[PDB]
Amino acid sequence: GTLRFFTVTDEYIAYLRKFESKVHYQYENNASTYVGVVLKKNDFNYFIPLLSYNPEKDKAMKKRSRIVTRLFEIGNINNPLGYLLHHNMIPVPDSELIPLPLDLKKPKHKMMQKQLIYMKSISEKIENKSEVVYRKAAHEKDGYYLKFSCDFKLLEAKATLYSKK
Template identity: 30%
Template sequence: MGKLMFYEVSNQYINYLKLFESKIPNINYDKNNKFVCGVVLSVDGFDYFAPISSFSKQQKTNILIKNSNGETISSIRFSFMIPIPKNEIKIKNFSKEEYKYRRLLLEEWQYCNSIKDKIISKANYIYKRYNSGYDKTLIKNCCDFKLLEEKCLEYQSYLQPIEEVAATKKIEDRDIEKENKNKNDWEIER
């Protein structure tokens, strides 16, 4: 595995998952949208990504991210990690951000890569511990990973009717446009 990267997830995919799992965090905020770090775990063909959060209290299901002065600046939250298909994610472009925020992102990214093995180990631990069913606190506080995997697989079939409706609408719009053009041409000839 190469370096960890920060990614933006499509709103459509997050909204889809929220239909089935209420613990999925919001990704849209007034100033800066939430993004994820990954791949933190690969299991059974699923690539998992964990959100980076401003939450700065140590918990069993997170790792605190520190700046160069050793101060906590954010965290990576494994309780909310999700499997994401490759076509629903894109690498976060730091250069599009304001200078101050870009510096923060870079510091977070560098720190995450400096503790990459710890991040991957923690993701694996949380995933296995949750799925064992023994830790009631994790079950209460984590997303249902197996349910998310099932919904991730079903996502393509969920999209198909949406894409078919969009394609049909395009054809209908094109037919209406053509009909209007023909009507206008006919009226001009009269």
């Protein structure tokens, strides 16, 4: 299975945000880019929101290396491209997943392409870190992970409810 870019329906996101405020806010062009599947655990497909790459932020993200993956450019490995926020990953039913088309003429999308090639090269780390975050927050109930992450199990209960509607 392959990593790709997606968006989620504004309706499904607004529904998850009823129960989990940690779920990334989005609407129309205040939209979130997600990457997946990072974790198939097991009927549920998990998608991580991606943030594009000042000294404030970059420093805060470095301190949260247990929960955030830093994206780099392949063939220019010291150039940071963005961040994967594992702690804010969500289960998304098949119906609410929207593939994201990229127009490579746009430099914005040209950089997204670069982020995906990097993510594909580190897919084992992405998959494993999502698993660590999932287990530490939902099964182990580890202090640091629980407080930063989405209530994964509650989201799973509400994801099946949405799709049985």
